[PDB]
Amino acid sequence: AGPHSMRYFETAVSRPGLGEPRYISVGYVDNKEFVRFDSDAENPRYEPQAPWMEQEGPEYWERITQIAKGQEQWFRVNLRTLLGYYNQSAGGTHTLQWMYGCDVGSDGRLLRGYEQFAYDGCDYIALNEDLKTWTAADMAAQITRRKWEQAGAAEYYRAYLEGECVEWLHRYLKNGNATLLRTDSPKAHVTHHPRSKGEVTLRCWALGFYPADITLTWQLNGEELTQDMELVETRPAGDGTFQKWASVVVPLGKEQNYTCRVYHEGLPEPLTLRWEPP
């Protein structure tokens, strides 16, 4: 499916008059949630979201929880700062999101790094792929950009990304590689539904697969068909696996010319299947 990855998704929502902003931080290794912090918890701390993370000791959790407190500060402060830059009223709810992390290649070194920020769901500022320059969406962001160029922030982030992000990722991989490097091939099947005069709908189902990376396509006479193919978003079954389907509209009596292709890394060979009556 690709290079290994560690990613953090952090978000803060201001709630004026209802207390502190709500702060949530979620960590993912290979797109699997493994760590989570919520500020509205009874004992706000980082908790494992994966069984292989209970292999970590006491000092780990307390340390990263401290980091969480510092981050809460940062978020509240800069929420207010952005209220400033955008000239907004102080009794509104607003969101500030931070996404960051590392994709590493087969050698174990930094392949790609991420540092991006959104305000009210819209891009604010993002570290370019050079890991040296900033893309600022608008005028309010240019302030932060000049400020951060002046301060040499890009080098700080690049140093974190090339350094400890990768080392942590390596560590985690080493602990959870039994469950992370596992595949569940999809069970595929085709359903048939009347649709209109002379027209039927064929639906290719891929169920119970892990990881979520999958390709479903149709085929008219052995040739790829995606034109007016309806694809739903890959969805969680809730038990760790995923589902997806792809549909086409087909002339009644011609269903035998159509095939569904399922590509998944769990399969030794791609699946090719058709509507099998009765």
Binding site: Y46, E164, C165, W168
Partner: peptide, 9 residues
């Protein structure tokens, strides 16, 4: 492990 923004807006 998560980390700090450190720098302010």
């Amino acid at each position: 492990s998560p980390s700090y923004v450190y720098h302010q807006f």
